[PDB]
Amino acid sequence: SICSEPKKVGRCKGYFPRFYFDSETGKCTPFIYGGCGGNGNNFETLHQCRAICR
């Protein structure tokens, strides 16, 4: 139920492409992560996001 956590950009001003599991859409999805205060629904690769959800 980590994939049920929401997309969290956080407040840092970094540019860090990541992937999260969108519930509404039911896919693994790219987003810009700021670099701090992220939650569990945050993966380095799309493969890595899918290979733990889907």
**CA 40-43-47 angle, 5° bins:** 135
* Residue 22 binds other proteins, judged by CB under 8 A: no
Using CB under 8 A, pick the residue from 14, 26, 39, 48 that binds other proteins. 14
Which residues does the chain break after (C to N > 2.5 Å)? none
Distance from C-alpha of 11 to C-alpha of 49, rounded to nearest angstrom = 22
Using CB under 8 A, pick the residue from 29, 35, 46, 53 that binds other proteins. 35
Using CB under 8 A, pick the residue from 17, 26, 44, 47 that binds other proteins. 17
List interacting residues with other proteins (CB under 8 A). Answer: 9-17, 32, 34-37
